Write an enzyme that holds these catalytic residues in place. Structure first.
Site, PDB file in Angstrom:
ATOM      1  N   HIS A 102       6.868   0.094  -5.970  1.00  0.00           N
ATOM      2  CA  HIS A 102       5.866  -0.713  -5.282  1.00  0.00           C
ATOM      3  C   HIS A 102       4.855  -1.308  -6.252  1.00  0.00           C
ATOM      4  O   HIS A 102       4.287  -2.371  -5.978  1.00  0.00           O
ATOM      5  CB  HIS A 102       5.158   0.133  -4.224  1.00  0.00           C
ATOM      6  CG  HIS A 102       6.079   0.694  -3.187  1.00  0.00           C
ATOM      7  ND1 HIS A 102       7.011   1.669  -3.469  1.00  0.00           N
ATOM      8  CD2 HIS A 102       6.218   0.413  -1.870  1.00  0.00           C
ATOM      9  CE1 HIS A 102       7.681   1.967  -2.371  1.00  0.00           C
ATOM     10  NE2 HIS A 102       7.220   1.219  -1.385  1.00  0.00           N
TER      11      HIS A 102
ATOM     12  N   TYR B  51       1.990   3.460   3.661  1.00  0.00           N
ATOM     13  CA  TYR B  51       2.715   4.724   3.721  1.00  0.00           C
ATOM     14  C   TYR B  51       1.785   5.887   4.031  1.00  0.00           C
ATOM     15  O   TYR B  51       2.190   6.838   4.709  1.00  0.00           O
ATOM     16  CB  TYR B  51       3.447   4.972   2.404  1.00  0.00           C
ATOM     17  CG  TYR B  51       4.513   3.947   2.110  1.00  0.00           C
ATOM     18  CD1 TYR B  51       4.202   2.770   1.445  1.00  0.00           C
ATOM     19  CD2 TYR B  51       5.827   4.151   2.505  1.00  0.00           C
ATOM     20  CE1 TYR B  51       5.169   1.827   1.178  1.00  0.00           C
ATOM     21  CE2 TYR B  51       6.803   3.212   2.242  1.00  0.00           C
ATOM     22  CZ  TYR B  51       6.467   2.051   1.579  1.00  0.00           C
ATOM     23  OH  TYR B  51       7.435   1.111   1.312  1.00  0.00           O
TER      24      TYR B  51
ATOM     25  N   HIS C 162      16.330  -0.282  -4.371  1.00  0.00           N
ATOM     26  CA  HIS C 162      15.247   0.284  -3.578  1.00  0.00           C
ATOM     27  C   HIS C 162      15.409  -0.126  -2.121  1.00  0.00           C
ATOM     28  O   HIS C 162      15.283  -1.309  -1.787  1.00  0.00           O
ATOM     29  CB  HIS C 162      13.886  -0.162  -4.114  1.00  0.00           C
ATOM     30  CG  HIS C 162      12.752   0.708  -3.668  1.00  0.00           C
ATOM     31  ND1 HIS C 162      12.016   0.449  -2.533  1.00  0.00           N
ATOM     32  CD2 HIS C 162      12.237   1.842  -4.200  1.00  0.00           C
ATOM     33  CE1 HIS C 162      11.092   1.382  -2.387  1.00  0.00           C
ATOM     34  NE2 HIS C 162      11.204   2.239  -3.386  1.00  0.00           N
ATOM     35  N   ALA C 163      15.698   0.846  -1.255  1.00  0.00           N
ATOM     36  CA  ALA C 163      15.954   0.563   0.151  1.00  0.00           C
ATOM     37  C   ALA C 163      14.887  -0.359   0.723  1.00  0.00           C
ATOM     38  O   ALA C 163      13.712  -0.282   0.354  1.00  0.00           O
ATOM     39  CB  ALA C 163      16.002   1.870   0.945  1.00  0.00           C
TER      40      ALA C 163
ATOM     41  N   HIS D  35      11.746  -0.437  10.544  1.00  0.00           N
ATOM     42  CA  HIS D  35      11.298  -1.776  10.182  1.00  0.00           C
ATOM     43  C   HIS D  35      12.126  -2.841  10.889  1.00  0.00           C
ATOM     44  O   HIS D  35      11.587  -3.863  11.330  1.00  0.00           O
ATOM     45  CB  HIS D  35      11.371  -1.961   8.667  1.00  0.00           C
ATOM     46  CG  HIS D  35      10.342  -1.179   7.915  1.00  0.00           C
ATOM     47  ND1 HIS D  35       8.990  -1.337   8.129  1.00  0.00           N
ATOM     48  CD2 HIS D  35      10.463  -0.236   6.952  1.00  0.00           C
ATOM     49  CE1 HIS D  35       8.321  -0.524   7.331  1.00  0.00           C
ATOM     50  NE2 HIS D  35       9.192   0.156   6.608  1.00  0.00           N
TER      51      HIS D  35
ATOM     52  N   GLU E 133       5.528   0.997   8.684  1.00  0.00           N
ATOM     53  CA  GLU E 133       6.161   2.112   7.989  1.00  0.00           C
ATOM     54  C   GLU E 133       6.338   3.311   8.910  1.00  0.00           C
ATOM     55  O   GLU E 133       7.284   4.091   8.743  1.00  0.00           O
ATOM     56  CB  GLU E 133       5.331   2.524   6.771  1.00  0.00           C
ATOM     57  CG  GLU E 133       4.740   1.380   5.955  1.00  0.00           C
ATOM     58  CD  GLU E 133       5.788   0.443   5.386  1.00  0.00           C
ATOM     59  OE1 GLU E 133       5.772  -0.754   5.743  1.00  0.00           O
ATOM     60  OE2 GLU E 133       6.627   0.902   4.582  1.00  0.00           O
TER      61      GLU E 133
ATOM     62  N   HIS F 128      13.715   5.188   8.351  1.00  0.00           N
ATOM     63  CA  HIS F 128      12.549   4.420   7.930  1.00  0.00           C
ATOM     64  C   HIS F 128      12.863   2.930   7.880  1.00  0.00           C
ATOM     65  O   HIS F 128      12.060   2.102   8.328  1.00  0.00           O
ATOM     66  CB  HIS F 128      12.061   4.901   6.566  1.00  0.00           C
ATOM     67  CG  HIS F 128      10.983   4.045   5.986  1.00  0.00           C
ATOM     68  ND1 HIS F 128       9.673   4.110   6.405  1.00  0.00           N
ATOM     69  CD2 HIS F 128      11.027   3.085   5.032  1.00  0.00           C
ATOM     70  CE1 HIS F 128       8.952   3.236   5.725  1.00  0.00           C
ATOM     71  NE2 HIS F 128       9.750   2.602   4.885  1.00  0.00           N
ATOM     72  N   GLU F 129      14.025   2.568   7.332  1.00  0.00           N
ATOM     73  CA  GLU F 129      14.413   1.163   7.285  1.00  0.00           C
ATOM     74  C   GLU F 129      14.704   0.627   8.681  1.00  0.00           C
ATOM     75  O   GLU F 129      14.324  -0.503   9.009  1.00  0.00           O
ATOM     76  CB  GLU F 129      15.633   0.990   6.379  1.00  0.00           C
ATOM     77  CG  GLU F 129      15.429   1.488   4.955  1.00  0.00           C
ATOM     78  CD  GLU F 129      14.351   0.724   4.213  1.00  0.00           C
ATOM     79  OE1 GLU F 129      13.903  -0.324   4.724  1.00  0.00           O
ATOM     80  OE2 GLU F 129      13.951   1.172   3.118  1.00  0.00           O
TER      81      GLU F 129
HETATM   82  O1  LIG Z   1      10.606   5.835  -1.709  1.00  0.00           O
HETATM   83  C1  LIG Z   1       9.437   5.358  -1.531  1.00  0.00           C
HETATM   84  O2  LIG Z   1       8.713   5.178  -2.475  1.00  0.00           O
HETATM   85  C2  LIG Z   1       8.950   5.013  -0.138  1.00  0.00           C
HETATM   86  C3  LIG Z   1       8.791   6.141   0.645  1.00  0.00           C
HETATM   87  C4  LIG Z   1      10.150   6.369   1.385  1.00  0.00           C
HETATM   88  C5  LIG Z   1       9.928   6.618   2.824  1.00  0.00           C
HETATM   89  C6  LIG Z   1      11.284   6.731   3.565  1.00  0.00           C
HETATM   90  C7  LIG Z   1      12.005   8.066   3.353  1.00  0.00           C
HETATM   91  C8  LIG Z   1      11.115   9.221   3.766  1.00  0.00           C
HETATM   92  C9  LIG Z   1       9.827   9.198   2.932  1.00  0.00           C
HETATM   93  C10 LIG Z   1       9.073   7.866   3.065  1.00  0.00           C
HETATM   94  C11 LIG Z   1      10.937   5.039   1.110  1.00  0.00           C
HETATM   95  N1  LIG Z   1      10.036   4.168   0.629  1.00  0.00           N
HETATM   96  C12 LIG Z   1      10.054   2.672   0.800  1.00  0.00           C
HETATM   97  O3  LIG Z   1       9.190   2.006   0.324  1.00  0.00           O
HETATM   98  C13 LIG Z   1      11.212   1.983   1.602  1.00  0.00           C
HETATM   99  P1  LIG Z   1      10.594   0.477   2.449  1.00  0.00           P
HETATM  100  O4  LIG Z   1      11.533   0.111   3.643  1.00  0.00           O
HETATM  101  O5  LIG Z   1       9.222   0.722   2.937  1.00  0.00           O
HETATM  102  C14 LIG Z   1      10.567  -0.907   1.211  1.00  0.00           C
HETATM  103  C15 LIG Z   1       9.378  -1.925   1.493  1.00  0.00           C
HETATM  104  C16 LIG Z   1       9.362  -3.122   0.455  1.00  0.00           C
HETATM  105  C17 LIG Z   1       9.921  -4.421   1.050  1.00  0.00           C
HETATM  106  C18 LIG Z   1       9.901  -5.624  -0.003  1.00  0.00           C
HETATM  107  C19 LIG Z   1      11.041  -5.906  -0.766  1.00  0.00           C
HETATM  108  C20 LIG Z   1      11.020  -6.958  -1.690  1.00  0.00           C
HETATM  109  C21 LIG Z   1       9.885  -7.713  -1.848  1.00  0.00           C
HETATM  110  C22 LIG Z   1       8.735  -7.429  -1.080  1.00  0.00           C
HETATM  111  C23 LIG Z   1       8.751  -6.387  -0.164  1.00  0.00           C
HETATM  112 ZN   LIG Z   2       8.554   1.031   4.987  1.00  0.00          ZN
END
Ligand SMILES: O=C(O)[C@@H]1C[C@@H](C2CCCCC2)CN1C(=O)CP(=O)(O)CCCCc1ccccc1
Ligand SMILES: [Zn+2]
Ligand SMILES: *[C@@H]1O[C@H](CO)[C@@H](O[C@@H]2O[C@H](CO)[C@@H](O[C@@H]3O[C@H](CO)[C@@H](O)[C@H](O)[C@@H]3O)[C@H](O)[C@H]2NC(C)=O)[C@H](O)[C@H]1NC(C)=O
Length: 585
Positions: free
Chosen positions: A468, A478, A308-309, A342, A366, A338-339
């Site tokens: 999540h 989000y 999971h990115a 962050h 986000e 998105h990454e």
């Molecule tokens: O795929 C999903 O469910 C959502 C929506 C999608 C987003 C990007 C692409 C376009 C649509 C929206 C991607 N994403 C994410 O959660 C990527 P993050 O970096 O927030 C991941 C945030 C979690 C960080 C973390 C990790 C370990 C322990 C505690 C915390």
């Molecule tokens: Zn994010």
């Protein structure tokens, strides 16, 4: 003691509290990219070793008063060490079960190495076989959901205990307290209503065409849409079927896939173009510590990791990493931004004390990356870089241009809304354990009009099937993102001279903001604040407004809204849906 005296001590507590963050953060990364019992035993230690620090930092305690109370938010550190381990243990047991899941191919029991990323993710995104999509749907949920029911219940009760010891009503009050606005749970409810007329018109449109392709037996014209046909396991985004159900197919696409293959794109190449964006805005250049310690491809060794990115901040200085099992396609390309959004946010407030080393509120964080995705989505920016060439943007094209944006980003707001709306109901006791499953699907049906592919029961527990959920990560961020990211995109399209409310052929939807330092400087200033100032102040530095406003997004899709209204009428399609019957008690 004077003001500086009390401040002279906090700085001594800033670092001491900031180091064990990195120790706990680094140990969390080891287990994040290398799922081992050995790494789990070390992550929880640094966490326990950290909780001991936060517990002591509390009793030992305008900008000042903020720090004295912004550095003491125990979170889960209010529980005893035994219950603290017990909480994180139950959480990791769900995330571990989520990332280690493996499956057998549809019609081949000898091949059983399939994983979420890439096989399952790309099966739903490109396979149009209902019985196949259904098979993998059940396999994914029966494996990532119910098996962790017991671990989840444990995680809930301890999350509630932590909320109490932190002096709060329930876990819901905690996640909401992050936005610091008693009139925010109601603000969200209002925005969803402003979006419902649009989403339902788009929902009806998709459903009819999904009925065209698969037939009436599989798609009811009046009932919720079987979510396994929306090119996404959770139906949070329907982009993977935008071309499959496009208004006018005999037009130019915006897949930007084969032209990434033709031009030999690599995961590292994509991230470079992302760094290329932020620099053009007179912002931070992606350092080398990222190129070294980051993971931009699924390791081909065979370990277990969380594909999971994600983007990490180990505090300290300039140590930023992204862990993303990247693939070569347009969908992944936006995941990068998105990454990166962050990562950038980290580099902006790294000069802040441990308290203010975070976004104004979870929404800002986000949103940053997706704001650039809005500009990249435009052909203007895709045309500058070969990916998009010979693109005769007609009037119909601009419909598909508005359409893809809808089935990609609009349908995501209801999804993000139901997730936290449900978890709040579990924390506040509004959802009894005996009705965990069918109250979840009831909300997904009400606010998104999608239902599972098969009748589920309370023996099943499907919420954990989302990353999540099993990871205890608030998702309202989000949602808030997809609301504010258009406000930011608005104030950033105006400072680049790319938006004037009314502009006919210089639309807010075709606003590409590349090489805009003025927008960057103002953006740098907002991100620089982080959690130093309340988010209304940060909200104003860039946008000029001080409240969340759906005016931006509502203006974004209004062109699509008018074509759906006029088109649904003619097509003779039903709007709205009956309640879902895919969950029995
Ligand atoms: O795929 C999903 O469910 C959502 C929506 C999608 C987003 C990007 C692409 C376009 C649509 C929206 C991607 N994403 C994410 O959660 C990527 P993050 O970096 O927030 C991941 C945030 C979690 C960080 C973390 C990790 C370990 C322990 C505690 C915390
Ligand atoms: Zn994010
Ligand atoms: C994923 O995590 C596991 C931990 O369970 C890692 O195992 C560890 O691997 C390192 C080497 O990469 C081992 O250290 C080595 O020790 C030998 C002596 O035994 C020494 O000669 C080497 O120079 C090196 O220092 C370590 O002992 C080992 N730990 C355990 C508990 O087995 C594994 O390497 C990680 N995987 C990846 C891909 O990083």
């Amino acid at each position: 003691p004077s003001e500086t005296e009390i401040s002279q001590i906090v700085e001594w507590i800033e670092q001491r509290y900031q180091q064990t963050k990195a120790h706990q953060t680094l140990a969390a990364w080891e287990y994040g990219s290398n799922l081992t019992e050995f790494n789990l035993s070390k992550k929880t230690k640094a966490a326990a070793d950290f909780a001991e620090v936060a517990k002591a930092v509390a009793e030992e305690l305008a900008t000042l008063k903020r720090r004295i109370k912004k550095l003491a938010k125990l979170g889960y550190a209010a529980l005893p060490a035994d219950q603290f381990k017990e909480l994180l243990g139950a959480i990791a047991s769900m995330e571990s079960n989520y990332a280690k899941a493996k499956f057998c191919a549809y019609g081949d029991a000898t091949k059983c190495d399939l994983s979420l990323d890439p096989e399952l993710t790309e099966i739903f995104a490109n396979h149009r076989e209902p019985e196949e999509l259904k098979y993998y749907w059940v396999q994914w949920y029966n494996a990532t959901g119910a098996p962790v029911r017991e671990s989840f219940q444990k995680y809930v009760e301890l999350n509630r205990q932590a909320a109490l010891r932190n002096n709060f009503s329930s876990g819901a009050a905690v996640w909401l307290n992050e936005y610091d606005d008693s009139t925010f749970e109601q603000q969200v409810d209002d925005v969803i209503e402003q979006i419902r007329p649009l989403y339902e018109q788009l929902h009806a449109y998709v459903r009819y065409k999904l009925r065209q392709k698969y037939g009436d037996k599989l798609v009811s014209p009046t009932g919720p849409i079987p979510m396994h046909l929306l090119g996404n396991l959770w139906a949070q985004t329907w982009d993977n079927i935008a071309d499959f159900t496009t208004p006018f197919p005999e037009k130019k696409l915006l897949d930007v896939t084969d032209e990434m293959i033709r031009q030999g794109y690599t995961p590292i190449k994509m991230f470079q173009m992302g760094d290329d964006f932020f620099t053009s805005l007179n912002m931070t250049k992606l350092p080398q510590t990222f190129w070294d310690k980051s993971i931009l491809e699924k390791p081909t060794d065979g370990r277990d990791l969380v594909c999971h990115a994600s983007a990490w901040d180990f505090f300290a200085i300039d140590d930023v990493r992204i862990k993303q099992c990247t693939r070569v396609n347009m969908r992944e390309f936006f995941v990068v931004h998105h990454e990166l959004g962050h990562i950038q946010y980290y580099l902006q407030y790294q000069h802040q004390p441990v308290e203010f080393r975070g976004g104004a509120n979870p929404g800002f964080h986000e949103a940053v990356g997706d704001v650039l995705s809005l500009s990249v989505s435009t052909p203007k920016h895709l045309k500058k870089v070969g990916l998009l060439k010979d693109y005769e943007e007609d009037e119909q094209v601009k419909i598909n241009q508005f359409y893809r944006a809808g089935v990609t980003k609009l349908v995501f707001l209801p999804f993000a809304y139901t997730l936290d709306k449900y978890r709040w109901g579990v924390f506040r006791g509004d959802i009894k354990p005996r009705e965990y499953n069918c109250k979840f699907w009831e909300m997904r049906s009400r606010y998104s009009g999608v239902e599972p592919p098969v009748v589920r029961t309370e023996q099943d527990f499907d919420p954990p099937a989302k990353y999540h959920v099993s990871a205890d990560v608030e998702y309202l961020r989000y949602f808030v993102s997809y609301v504010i990211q258009f406000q930011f995109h608005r104030a950033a399209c105006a400072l680049a001279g790319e938006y004037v409310k009314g502009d006919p052929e210089k639309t807010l939807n075709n606003c590409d903001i590349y090489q805009s330092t003025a927008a960057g400087n103002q953006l740098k200033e907002m991100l620089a604040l982080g959690s130093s100032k309340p988010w209304p102040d940060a909200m104003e530095v860039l946008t000029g407004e001080r409240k969340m406003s759906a005016d931006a997004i509502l203006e974004y899709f209004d062109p699509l809204y008018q074509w759906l209204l006029e088109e649904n009428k003619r097509l003779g399609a039903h709007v709205g849906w009956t309640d879902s019957q895919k969950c029995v008690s």
